[PDB]
Design a protein around this ligand. Structure first.
Ligand SMILES: Cc1cn([C@H]2C[C@H](O)[C@@H](COP(=O)(O)OP(=O)(O)O)O2)c(=O)[nH]c1=O
Ligand SMILES: Cc1cn([C@H]2C[C@H](O)[C@@H](COP(=O)(O)OP(=O)(O)O)O2)c(=O)[nH]c1=O
Lengths: 134, 136
């Protein structure tokens, strides 16, 4: 798989614009939108996977280093353009690293926040996969 | 505001800050589209129009921007500059975006897909448009 989504960009004298439509340029319906900013420290994040949740990650400013693990393949990608999406399907583990100081990271979700949809142990993540594989 | 301006609950920890918007929860409508303006330049604005059905929430994710709202009746201006603050733009509300900082990133939550046909690009028209509404 290739989980990158290159969004259609509009350009003019004024700037750039990108539009994201649920079930249009993204495979799911948007129920939530969240973002990280004014970041500090050197601790990364993510380190989990969901069971039902489908999301798309967008680095609206600065850049961030993201790693994805479908259980089969691990893909490291550096997000440094707002016209690039990252699709994090269900059962896909993820981590965000190297956040720029000026970074703004945005996530689009298929569902509302649910602490219970978070698999926080890689090992378990892996286990879960197998079972799926079965 | 008691209506137009929204304050989202923001979370601050050792790693940074985080804001979360949930459709028909912290925002009165259903999220359908999400677009964003970035890498801006020049001294010519954006906006200048109204919608008949489209509802939106503007949010300045980085840098700042000056937005003027006009329900026909009253005019309101507000400088957006904190990702935690949302600006509700209901239907029949004319709007304009100004003074985008160089590092500006404006995001916009919309209730529906892009549709040229729901725009009102003419002030006057907006005015007439309005006028009417009142009647009814
Ligand atoms: C991502 C997200 C987080 N939050 C909350 C939960 C946390 O207390 C904080 C986000 O931190 P989070 O990145 O989920 O890390 P952790 O759970 O390890 O603290 O804000 C929401 O309310 N909604 C969301 O959509
Ligand atoms: C806002 C938006 C615009 N667009 C398109 C419509 C236009 O072709 C282009 C520019 O948007 P807009 O700023 O409204 O253009 P202008 O005022 O110069 O006419 O982007 C989409 O495709 N989807 C969207 O969600």
């Amino acid at each position: 798989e290739n989980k990158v989504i290159n969004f259609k960009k509009i350009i003019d004298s004024r700037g750039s614009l990108v539009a994201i439509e649920e079930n249009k340029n993204i495979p799911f319906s948007i129920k939530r939108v969240y973002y990280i900013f004014d970041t500090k420290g050197e601790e990364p994040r993510g380190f989990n996977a969901h069971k039902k949740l489908e999301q798309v990650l967008v680095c609206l400013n600065g850049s961030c280093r993201v790693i994805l693990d479908d259980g089969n393949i691990i893909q490291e990608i550096t997000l440094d353009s707002p016209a690039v999406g990252l699709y994090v399907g269900p059962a896909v583990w993820h981590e965000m690293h190297d956040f720029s100081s000026d970074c703004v990271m945005m996530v689009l979700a298929s569902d509302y926040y649910d602490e219970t949809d978070y698999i926080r142990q890689y090992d378990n993540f892996k286990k879960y996969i197998a079972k799926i594989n079965l």
